[PDB]
């Protein structure tokens, strides 16, 4: 059907409050399925998806050992970047990284991703071609210079095109009832008068997957629209709505249009009293 | 599975 894989690493420093903290979560499409924390007294790779719990103990000991060495790897990375900017040892700093492979409808990769950050700023990234890098500042070149000679991008090109695609594919089959089956939203339109001349028309979309959805308000001539967007529900589905202030008296003229993957055809809604 | 070995910064 469709596939995507992402890994969200996060390493922050707490001078005086202990050692740096490392947090890692895994994603397939918009469904989180891995969770790891360094501060737990029992730090183990926890799962958040029903289809992965099938994996044996060697899988979970592997994922735990990897993160138990990445917490020492980024702790030195925090000390190294602290030296590049000669930042004070009493300052808190954070490093964030994202990577993963993207599978295509044919079955092979389309775009492999790898990117890091420091204090919320882009630090270093792997290019579209998996071989090179792109530095953001002067200090990024220091780390770039090391990975140029250690063939770090060589490891990623073999991982993103190898184990990542092989396992992102295995996850699609073990959970195809939910990962390859999209659920259209539960849509309805509400209304609440604000004044004698104005009125609020809110269009709801509930319980949909994946997260991508479009909600717009339109008068038969054209389209206008307050849009708080894509909050989660906690049941691995998301909720979203769009509202518009309409003149009370001419209310029926406004229409709501929904564009979603799970819908066979785009919907058009009108507030029916 | 995540990336097996990580470089440092």
């Amino acid at each position, epitope marked *: 059907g469709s596939h995507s894989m992402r890994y969200f690493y996060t390493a922050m420093s707490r001078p005086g409050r202990g050692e740096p903290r490392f947090i890692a979560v895994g994603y397939v499409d918009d469904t989180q399925f891995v969770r790891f924390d360094s501060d737990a007294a029992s730090p183990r790779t926890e799962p958040r998806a029903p289809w992965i719990e099938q994996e044996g103990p060697e899988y979970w000991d592997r994922n735990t050992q*990897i993160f138990k060495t990445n917490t020492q790897t980024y702790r030195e990375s925090l000390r190294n970047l602290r030296g590049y900017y000669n930042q004070s040892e009493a300052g808190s700093h954070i490093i964030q990284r994202m990577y993963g492979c993207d599978l295509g409808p044919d079955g092979r990769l389309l775009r492999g991703h790898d990117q890091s950050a420091y204090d919320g700023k882009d630090y270093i990234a792997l290019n579209e071609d998996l071989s090179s890098w792109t530095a953001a500042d002067t200090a990024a070149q220091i780390t770039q210079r090391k990975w140029e000679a250690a063939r770090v991008a060589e490891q990623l090109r073999a991982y993103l095109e190898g184990l990542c695609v092989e396992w992102l594919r295995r996850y699609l089959e073990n959970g195809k009832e939910t990962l390859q089956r999209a659920d259209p939203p539960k849509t309805h339109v509400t209304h609440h008068p604000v004044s004698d001349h104005e009125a609020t028309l809110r269009c709801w979309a509930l319980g949909f997957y994946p997260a991508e959805i479009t909600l717009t308000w339109q008068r038969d001539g054209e389209d206008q629209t307050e849009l708080v967007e894509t909050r989660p529900a906690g049941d691995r589905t998301f909720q979203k709505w769009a509202a518009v202030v309409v003149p009370s008296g001419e209310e029926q003229r406004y229409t709501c249009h929904v564009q979603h993957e799970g819908l066979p055809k785009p919907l058009t809604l009108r507030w029916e009293p | 599975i995540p990336l097996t070995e990580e470089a440092e910064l």
Partner: T-cell receptor
Amino acid sequence: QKVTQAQTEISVVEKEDVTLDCVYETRDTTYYLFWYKQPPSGELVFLIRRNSFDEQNEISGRYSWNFQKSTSSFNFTITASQVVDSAVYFCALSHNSGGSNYKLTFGKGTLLTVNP
Amino acid sequence: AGVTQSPTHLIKTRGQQVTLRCSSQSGHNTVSWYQQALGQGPQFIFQYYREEENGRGNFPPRFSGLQFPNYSSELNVNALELDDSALYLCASSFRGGKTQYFGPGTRLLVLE
């Protein structure tokens, strides 16, 4: 998993092309292959690095390597063998054993001797 | 001078303590120790990373190790036996491309 070098010893003469046979078995897809030469001093020198996504044929100098994923073999070929090429050649495999570690696994060892 | 290993040859009696040392290259951060018998290939003892053991394979607890912040490593082996006589090789890498640059080795011999 395991690596196997069936050739125990090889006796060749100068200017003769000798090939070395190294086969591997490995279910996980991502791995890094290697070839090492060990002169009688005892140390191993770094010759080659091969990966899973690389090509089938690759030749450099008198050394000609043949990596194919169907046969799961990395058979090595030495063209116009000289006296200096007499040593022990190992092929290793960098797989995932346990976790967070790509460990190496060396084969039995092929003794190559070039007689005058 | 990236690859060194001291000493070269060593003779000890059955049931003693030996400490083999190794120096890493300027750009490397890992040390992997191996043991090569006369017929077999180099078998993988533990690998160290930033003074904390990374992973060990098929060796008893008496085989121990330690890594110093200046990229210097050791191999503290206890309770020697006659079969512990082998060639002990030292490797180095930097957590990037998995390439192991071996050292000159150490010919250890244990006698009764």
